[PDB]
Scaffold this active site. Structure first.
Site, PDB file in Angstrom:
ATOM      1  N   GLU A 236      -5.511   3.263 -10.668  1.00 53.51           N
ATOM      2  CA  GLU A 236      -6.252   1.718 -10.510  1.00 53.51           C
ATOM      3  C   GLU A 236      -7.362   1.880 -11.448  1.00 53.51           C
ATOM      4  O   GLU A 236      -7.819   0.569 -11.773  1.00 53.51           O
ATOM      5  CB  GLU A 236      -6.893   1.568  -8.830  1.00 53.51           C
ATOM      6  CG  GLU A 236      -5.636   1.834  -7.786  1.00 53.51           C
ATOM      7  CD  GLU A 236      -6.105   1.454  -6.474  1.00 53.51           C
ATOM      8  OE1 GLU A 236      -6.197   0.452  -5.984  1.00 53.51           O
ATOM      9  OE2 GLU A 236      -6.336   2.739  -5.880  1.00 53.51           O
TER      10      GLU A 236
ATOM     11  N   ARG B 115      -0.116   4.547   2.869  1.00 51.68           N
ATOM     12  CA  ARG B 115       0.040   4.362   4.597  1.00 51.68           C
ATOM     13  C   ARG B 115       0.484   5.746   5.256  1.00 51.68           C
ATOM     14  O   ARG B 115       0.073   5.537   6.535  1.00 51.68           O
ATOM     15  CB  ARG B 115       1.097   3.369   4.603  1.00 51.68           C
ATOM     16  CG  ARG B 115       0.500   1.871   4.228  1.00 51.68           C
ATOM     17  CD  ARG B 115       1.599   0.957   4.474  1.00 51.68           C
ATOM     18  NE  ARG B 115       2.637   1.011   3.541  1.00 51.68           N
ATOM     19  CZ  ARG B 115       3.856   0.416   3.547  1.00 51.68           C
ATOM     20  NH1 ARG B 115       4.130  -0.068   4.690  1.00 51.68           N
ATOM     21  NH2 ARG B 115       4.678  -0.008   2.688  1.00 51.68           N
TER      22      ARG B 115
ATOM     23  N   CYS C 299       0.803  -1.253   0.055  1.00 49.06           N
ATOM     24  CA  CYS C 299       0.044  -0.119  -0.019  1.00 49.06           C
ATOM     25  C   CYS C 299       0.946   1.152  -0.015  1.00 49.06           C
ATOM     26  O   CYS C 299       1.578   1.667   0.892  1.00 49.06           O
ATOM     27  CB  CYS C 299      -0.936   0.100   1.118  1.00 49.06           C
ATOM     28  SG  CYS C 299      -1.985   1.196   1.286  1.00 49.06           S
TER      29      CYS C 299
ATOM     30  N   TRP D  63      -9.686   5.757  -0.358  1.00 50.18           N
ATOM     31  CA  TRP D  63     -10.355   6.271  -1.630  1.00 50.18           C
ATOM     32  C   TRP D  63      -9.276   5.727  -2.722  1.00 50.18           C
ATOM     33  O   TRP D  63      -8.071   4.996  -2.445  1.00 50.18           O
ATOM     34  CB  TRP D  63     -10.116   7.604  -1.814  1.00 50.18           C
ATOM     35  CG  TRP D  63      -8.438   8.328  -0.872  1.00 50.18           C
ATOM     36  CD1 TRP D  63      -7.501   8.597  -1.881  1.00 50.18           C
ATOM     37  CD2 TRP D  63      -8.490   8.884   0.221  1.00 50.18           C
ATOM     38  NE1 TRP D  63      -6.518   8.909  -0.996  1.00 50.18           N
ATOM     39  CE2 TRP D  63      -7.224   9.273   0.044  1.00 50.18           C
ATOM     40  CE3 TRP D  63      -9.258   9.096   1.322  1.00 50.18           C
ATOM     41  CZ2 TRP D  63      -6.412   9.920   1.301  1.00 50.18           C
ATOM     42  CZ3 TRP D  63      -8.620   9.778   2.379  1.00 50.18           C
ATOM     43  CH2 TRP D  63      -7.294   9.791   2.502  1.00 50.18           C
TER      44      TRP D  63
END
Ligand code: HEM
Ligand code: HEM
Ligand code: XFJ
Ligand code: XFJ
Ligand code: H4B
Ligand code: H4B
Ligand code: CL
Ligand code: CL
Lengths: 362, 362
Positions: free
Chosen positions: B242, B68, B65, B237
């Site tokens: 992506e 973070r 991720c 969000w």
């Protein structure tokens, strides 16, 4: 035991090489000869066939190279006979001329005498045979920052660059037994360069960008069956992203994205406008167009990945395991548009191979 | 020894958690209580403070991720009290409403009762709480191929999709002791969607693309101090790539790049034109523009990487080691334009963390 490392690497290479060449019955006799030769002399000498096939295997085993489909057509030039600085200089000029081939680039490697007891016979100081100088003097940045260190060493030895952004560095190499390297200016008639223009945007030429035609890497050791060829420059043709996403775009290299944005008429103000991504695409389109227009070989990253897929298929068909480094194989632009992004690769080191080695400056 | 795995994970988590919360003096007594509780019951129950800080640590430890930096502001909803299917359904509707927050997205996780002896109390079949159906029937492809398997399982249980390219799947989950999962249609008033338009190119709306506002992952187990919360959906969000480089662009997903090329007026014929890269940039610009215009939270990959750099700096300042998976952290468009591309990351697994788990179909 250094002698032991040698024999073990030697056994492994000859067995593999001869199997691939259809010569497996000659392995026994060859290994015998080699064993005696190590016994007496502390080393052994490759046959021309061994050396050629070894360099081609070493390319085939280079985990970080997307270009390996063409490994079996490598042009190998055997210069284990050179003894003087003039002979080395001339062999390097020759490699440039024959590899360039008037723009129809031939992948080529020139092999010089190997290390003897870790003792180099020839030590090349260049990172590539053709590369641009770099300078930094209180604030002022000129040329390629990646070359600052080497440029400074050359200027210690009495060379002086013109301080354009594209000065060609001289060849610089030291011979066994000499304290200082010598240097020689490259003859400009041997060096192809390509002006960068865009197929649709006239203003792109206002940036006055150019790059050289042929990347000739001279900073790696070729290892074949335990023999260490530290001086063995080799070249391919470029993949366009190396020029347009990295040499011309990176902040620590020529840093041209804000200038590219201005000339293609977009603002460079807001991350959400994706101006950097847009500028990268137009710069990379310009690089491919420009090399094609001038008749200099280049490949785009989509065609390159398709070739690489054929390399994977070929390896499977031949019963050879495939090794690769995913972090270097993915292209720096649109990586997920290639098949490479979506699979994984075994990053094991297999020999023969090419190995990085640091320079005397640095 | 399963009991032994538990106590060991428990000791490690409490010590770390209480150190971070300034409560290190209470560690001794807490571990005592926990040890007795495992002794008698075969498990232990987290305090509300433990559970909240554990979910936040688990996000902070998610190597894959880029988001973070914001780990400490995670909104944690404790639903370890639910016992019926109506209560589960309502808790999931609530998570959607509160996380959406009228478009100003709040990162949120809802935690359901943990596995007892590897025995699930609640088993969610969805991969995300909001996702589009997919169909394939002799040649004809409709909707999201990534959802074909789950869509087919739902249609076994008596649901029927309209077979648009954007059918919302029902919530589907099974309770301990039931043979079949139940399903419930999502109320459309809870689901924000965003039509995709381009800031400069009017024709882009002819593609009739849309995506949903909030990714709510429901396919992972939260592990905290040896307790396994298999049902614990969480959302952030989106990062725009992506949606634009992966959900809408990938050949095995909506596969829209040739259609994008046609509407932005470029040919899709020659790899060297870099039309795929150009189409990817314009599609990703459209996705960011469209979410911003509608007032739905989103971040571009440049801003996201800058935030991630602050996360690295924060970790160093706090004396915590940083872990990351470079192959997931780099964005799929212009990766080398981010600092992430140019450094390396220790991909060690640290707990608490989130772990993938496969579904009953599949
Ligand atoms: C024929 C056209 C060729 C193309 C298009 C090609 C492409 C490339 C590219 C794109 C890289 C990665 C550069 C980077 O991302 O930093 C690379 C690395 C490499 N290539 Fe190839 N290559 C070709 C030929 C060759 C040849 C002829 C050899 C050796 C005989 C070779 C050996 C390597 C090695 C050893 C590396 C790793 C270099 C390093 O670690 O610094 N390649 N290649
Ligand atoms: C707040 C905004 C957030 C953003 C922009 C963000 C961004 C992302 C992105 C881009 C990925 C990689 C997806 C891919 O490339 O396939 C990812 C993966 C992940 N994120 Fe975040 N994230 C955010 C919040 C969260 C939250 C709130 C959690 C958990 C509490 C979380 C946990 C993860 C995990 C566990 C993965 C790995 C998923 C997998 O393996 O399938 N993220 N995130
Ligand atoms: C034969 C060849 C053909 C081609 N098209 N590209 C290449 C890549 C050449 C290249 C250019 N810039 C940079 C590098 C990386 C240099 C490099 C640096 C360090 C420190 C270690 C290491 N292994 N490598 C490599 C080689
Ligand atoms: C909370 C969150 C926020 C955000 N902006 N993005 C994400 C990424 C979600 C996401 C979307 N599509 C695909 C995946 C990968 C799914 C996935 C699949 C498999 C097989 C293993 C594994 N570890 N993960 C993940 C999560
Ligand atoms: C293992 C292999 O690297 C695999 O194809 C990965 C590539 N990296 C990824 N990166 C992201 N961001 N998302 C993914 O789903 C994957 N899959
Ligand atoms: C180790 C770390 O992944 C490092 O920054 C790498 C990234 N991958 C790379 N990839 C390419 N193609 N070239 C490089 O020089 C590097 N450096
Ligand atoms: Cl280069
Ligand atoms: Cl998604």
């Amino acid at each position: 035991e250094e002698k032991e490392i040698l024999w073990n690497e030697a056994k492994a290479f000859i067995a593999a090489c001869y199997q691939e060449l259809g010569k497996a019955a000659e392995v026994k006799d060859r290994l015998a000869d080699i064993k005696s030769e190590i016994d007496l002399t502390g080393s052994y000498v490759h046959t021309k066939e061994e050396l050629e096939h070894g360099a081609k295997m070493a390319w085939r085993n280079s985990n970080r190279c997307i270009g390996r489909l063409f490994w079996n057509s490598l042009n190998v030039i055997d210069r284990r006979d050179v003894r003087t600085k003039e002979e080395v200089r001339d062999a390097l000029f020759h490699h440039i001329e024959t590899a360039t081939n008037n723009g129809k680039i031939r992948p080529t490697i020139t092999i010089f005498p190997p290390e003897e007891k870790g003792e180099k016979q020839v030590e090349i100081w260049n990172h590539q045979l053709i590369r641009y100088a770099g300078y930094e003097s209180d604030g002022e940045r000129i040329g390629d920052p990646a070359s600052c260190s080497l440029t400074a060493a050359c200027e210690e030895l009495g060379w002086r660059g013109e301080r354009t952004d594209f000065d060609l560095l001289p060849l610089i190499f030291r011979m066994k037994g000499d304290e200082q390297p010598v240097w020689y200016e490259l003859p400009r008639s041997l060096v192809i360069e390509v002006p960068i223009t865009h197929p649709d945007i006239e203003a792109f030429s206002d940036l006055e960008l150019k790059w050289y035609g042929v990347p000739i890497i001279s900073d790696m050791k070729l290892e074949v069956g335990g023999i260490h060829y530290n001086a063995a420059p080799f070249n391919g043709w470029y993949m366009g992203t190396e020029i347009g996403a990295r040499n011309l775009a990176d902040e620590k290299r020529y840093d041209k994205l804000k200038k590219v944005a201005s000339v293609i008429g977009i603002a460079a103000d807001y991350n959400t406008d994706l101006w950097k991504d847009q500028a990268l695409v137009e710069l990379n389109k310009a690089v491919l167009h420009s090399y094609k227009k001038q008749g200099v070989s280049i490949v785009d990253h989509h065609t390159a990945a398709s070739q690489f897929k054929r390399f994977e298929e070929q390896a499977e068909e031949a019963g050879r395991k495939l090794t690769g480094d995913w972090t270097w194989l993915i292209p720096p632009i649109s990586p997920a548009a290639t098949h490479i992004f979506h699979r994984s690769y075994d990053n094991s080191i297999v020999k023969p191979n090419y190995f990085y080695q640091d320079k005397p400056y640095e």
